[PDB]
Structure 1
Amino acid sequence: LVPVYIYSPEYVSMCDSLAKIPKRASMVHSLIEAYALHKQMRIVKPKVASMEEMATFHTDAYLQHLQKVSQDDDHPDSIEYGLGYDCPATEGIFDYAAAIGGATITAAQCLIDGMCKVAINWSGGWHHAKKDEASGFCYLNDAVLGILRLRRKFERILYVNLDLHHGDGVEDAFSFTSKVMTVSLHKFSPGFFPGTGDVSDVGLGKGRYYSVNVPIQDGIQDEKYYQICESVLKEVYQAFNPKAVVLQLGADTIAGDPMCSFNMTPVGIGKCLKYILQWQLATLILGGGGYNLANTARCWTYLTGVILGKTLSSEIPDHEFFTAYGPDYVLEITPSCRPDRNEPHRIQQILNYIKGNLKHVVIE
């Protein structure tokens, strides 16, 4: 059955007002629309998240504060709740947060109701927010909210974070439970945000070994990334037997991102995505980071094509943002001539560590 595409003109307009990524949502949607991919999808208007739905993870104190300042960047309680340079108390930020949370919840509900096997919210994936604090441009953790909605039907949910940054907010939220396993492939290097997610972080208490982290260094390309991803997910699948998947596909790993860390292309990420889709589980697709706006659109458009199993023309079709795609005006991204800093011995060590940990899961 046909993938659900979480979309409304209002939703994109709201997502467009996010101060760190202005107009990104429109560029992503308009490229998908320019490739006519939306015609092959079921378009679903997202619901706005209610106070009660948001409070299934976030505290009432934090949410009431967010609501207050959304109507104010100099409040004395904002520092406590993580509001600052990374998460400015922009006017309307509570509405933008409620829209993105509601969108991912709507995606989850569609999956629960058997409307689709795959549901897409490219504007979601704000995985750093904590129950009571904003963090890393994230004011509300829609990925956690999405997982909590899926928990209505699924007893084993797998969260997979393929983003440059560790999905710390999500991992933390489920650190003590075994119903949700988190798997994160991300850059791990002292001083690099958020600073967590070493391979030794495996969760706590009853959630011990139900958090998986794959610390990766600068320069990694498609082939090695896919090998790492396939070997981990093969072990996770056999060990954990997930019944639903929440997959975050950040674009901030792609060559050309100004963070200039990993050296991936959308084709490489696509392979990881294909590996997960062939499990044929209810899958909630989210975006994430992506700071080269045109490349982020290239990436999520291509990946939408993968979900649909469609091969797209390399030539960017004319559309509202055509000029943003110069000077080559093509869909494909070329890797930078930068060294891969990932030692094959270190990769193997990490993978063996992880296999060791998942052995404990299997024997349980």
Structure 2
Amino acid sequence: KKVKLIGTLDYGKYRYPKNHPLKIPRVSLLLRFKDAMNLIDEKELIKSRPATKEELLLFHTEDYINTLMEAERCQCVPKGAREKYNIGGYENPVSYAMFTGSSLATGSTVQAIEEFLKGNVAFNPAGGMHHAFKSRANGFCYINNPAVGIEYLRKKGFKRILYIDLDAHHCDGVQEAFYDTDQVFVLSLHQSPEYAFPFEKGFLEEIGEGKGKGYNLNIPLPKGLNDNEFLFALEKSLEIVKEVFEPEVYLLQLGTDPLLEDYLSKFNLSNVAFLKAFNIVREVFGEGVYLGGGGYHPYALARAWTLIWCELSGREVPEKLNNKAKELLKSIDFEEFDDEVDRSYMLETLKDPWRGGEVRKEVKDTLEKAKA
């Protein structure tokens, strides 16, 4: 069984614009970072390929896909598309990430699935664009690779597919996509919509509809979440899923936004708890298909996914970053949101110290209601 990382430095040329949180390098940064740390070899890397039109149409509608292609190459917001497809605003702007970069991340998810089906283990850090809808952009996402991937598996004959989303934001796009079926089960832990995007979905009472009622489980969590609370919630929710669903295969999305250093979440987790969460899922369901996700702090993203790569790859995690790696991170013009918190300590070690605490009653209550 080989372990593979799907990626390419080309993502670096399809960055979001200016002000946008996705302006920073991410998968290209991960690749350069693992290379600088000498934690990856050429034969472990599979070059990302674009999703084909056919693969895209496994989930998205033609008119929507055609609009993304036209908007991108002509660099415009076609008449009626802002309203109809949610394209053009600050959130889902016109850029080359809208179709080319998105198609590359999505093809990489199909590649990750292809590798898994060959019996190998793969990680597509560019994947996990979980907010896009069948025919509309949303939450910085234009193409929903998790949904394309799940439909890819359904076409292959899988009838029990589990999707687990550990990103700090709700996979509203994925929820809608499989809300109606009992063939797919979606579990998402995320900041409560009472205070975080998408605000409109992500509540605990959304458990599906029709045949799929009972096959969607949202675990909304509070501000200031610590490591113990996140892992408590994870272990308990996995038990709920396990008692009701026996997956033939599962996909796991690993956005790094739940970390303390990422301002896009009110969660204050450590990279080490992030790593334990990943391993807890594997202990419960064995090996699955691994995807990236939201993560908007370059240092946080790089070190955390590096822990994931080291776990999968079977190599020891160095306790410190070498010079090439620190200089790489320092070269990223990022600018911390808070004028000065000082995140330079992140350059001094790969793993951060645990960030635990007591498990609040709120969290215990949510999981108890989720069970019933």
Shift of 1:93: 2.8
Partner amino acid for 2:128? G
Partner-residue secondary structure (3-state), 1:94: helix
Is 1:332 matched with 2:351?
Answer: yes
2: CA distance between counterparts of 1:301 and 1:153?
Answer: 33
1: CA distance between counterparts of 2:192 and 2:284?
Answer: 28
Shift of 1:348: 2.2
Kept in 1, the 8 Å contact 2:126–2:293? The answer is yes
Choose the corresponding residue for 1:301, options 287, 302, 306: 306
Which residue in 1 is equivalent to 2:334?
A: none
Partner amino acid for 1:353? K
Is 1:59 matched with 2:61?
Answer: yes
Partner amino acid for 1:332? K
Which residue in 2 is equivalent to 1:247?
A: 252
Is 1:122 matched with 2:120?
Answer: no
Which residue in 1 is equivalent to 2:37?
A: 35
Kept in 2, the 8 Å contact 1:54–1:145? The answer is yes
Partner amino acid for 1:17? R
Partner amino acid for 2:221? I
2: CA distance between counterparts of 1:170 and 1:41?
Answer: 32
Kept in 2, the 8 Å contact 1:35–1:312? The answer is no
* Equivalent residues in 2 for 1:81-96, closer than 5 Å: 81-83=85-87, 84-91=89-96, 93-96=98-101
Deviation string for 1:246-271 (max 9, x for gaps)? Answer: 11111111011122510001111211
Which residue in 2 is equivalent to 1:46?
A: 48
Name which of structure 1's ranges 44-53 and 321-330 shifts more when overlaid on structure 2: 321-330
Kept in 2, the 8 Å contact 1:32–1:38? The answer is yes
Structure 2, unmatched stretches of 5+, are: 331-342
Deviation string for 1:204-245 (max 9, x for gaps)? Answer: 110001000100011111122111101111231232011211
Kept in 2, the 8 Å contact 1:180–1:210? The answer is yes
Choose the corresponding residue for 2:147, options 132, 144, 147: 144
2: CA distance between counterparts of 1:223 and 1:306?
Answer: 21
Is 1:264 matched with 2:283?
Answer: no
Kept in 2, the 8 Å contact 1:4–1:120? The answer is yes
Kept in 1, the 8 Å contact 2:228–2:359? The answer is no
Structure 1, unmatched stretches of 5+, are: 357-364
1: CA distance between counterparts of 2:314 and 2:276?
Answer: 12
2: CA distance between counterparts of 1:314 and 1:288?
Answer: 25
**Cα distance 1:241–1:40, how it changes in 2: closer, same or farther (>3 A)?**
farther
**Cα distance 1:91–1:37, how it changes in 2: closer, same or farther (>3 A)?**
closer
Report the RMSD for the aligned CA atoms in angstroms.
2.3
Is 1:344 matched with 2:342?
Answer: no
Kept in 2, the 8 Å contact 1:28–1:297? The answer is yes
Choose the corresponding residue for 1:215, options 207, 220, 241: 220
Shift of 1:295: 1.0
* Equivalent residues in 2 for 1:186-197, closer than 5 Å: 186-195=190-199, 196-197=201-202
TM-score by length of 2: 0.87
Deviation string for 1:317-337 (max 9, x for gaps)? Answer: 23266253573322133578x
Which residue in 1 is equivalent to 2:176?
A: 172
Deviation string for 1:111-138 (max 9, x for gaps)? Answer: 2232x1x210111111000001010110
**Cα distance 1:189–1:53, how it changes in 2: closer, same or farther (>3 A)?**
closer
2: CA distance between counterparts of 1:131 and 1:300?
Answer: 28
Number of matched residues?
A: 349
**Cα distance 1:113–1:335, how it changes in 2: closer, same or farther (>3 A)?**
closer
Partner amino acid for 2:183? K
2: CA distance between counterparts of 1:74 and 1:104?
Answer: 27
Which residue in 1 is equivalent to 2:189?
A: 185
Kept in 2, the 8 Å contact 1:111–1:283? The answer is yes
2: CA distance between counterparts of 1:155 and 1:323?
Answer: 44
Partner-residue secondary structure (3-state), 1:278: helix
Shift of 1:304: 1.5
Is 1:160 matched with 2:164?
Answer: yes
1: CA distance between counterparts of 2:278 and 2:195?
Answer: 29
Is 1:4 matched with 2:8?
Answer: no
2: CA distance between counterparts of 1:172 and 1:313?
Answer: 41
Which residue in 1 is equivalent to 2:370?
A: 354
TM-score by length of 1: 0.89
Partner amino acid for 1:60? E
Kept in 2, the 8 Å contact 1:3–1:41? The answer is no
Which residue in 2 is equivalent to 1:360?
A: none
Choose the corresponding residue for 1:75, options 73, 78, 85: 78
Which residue in 2 is equivalent to 1:359?
A: none
2: CA distance between counterparts of 1:145 and 1:169?
Answer: 11
Kept in 2, the 8 Å contact 1:255–1:334? The answer is no
Partner amino acid for 2:308? L
2: CA distance between counterparts of 1:41 and 1:236?
Answer: 36
2: CA distance between counterparts of 1:162 and 1:44?
Answer: 24
1: CA distance between counterparts of 2:164 and 2:31?
Answer: 23
Shift of 1:280: 5.9
Partner-residue secondary structure (3-state), 1:319: helix
**Cα distance 1:191–1:227, how it changes in 2: closer, same or farther (>3 A)?**
closer
1: CA distance between counterparts of 2:97 and 2:198?
Answer: 26
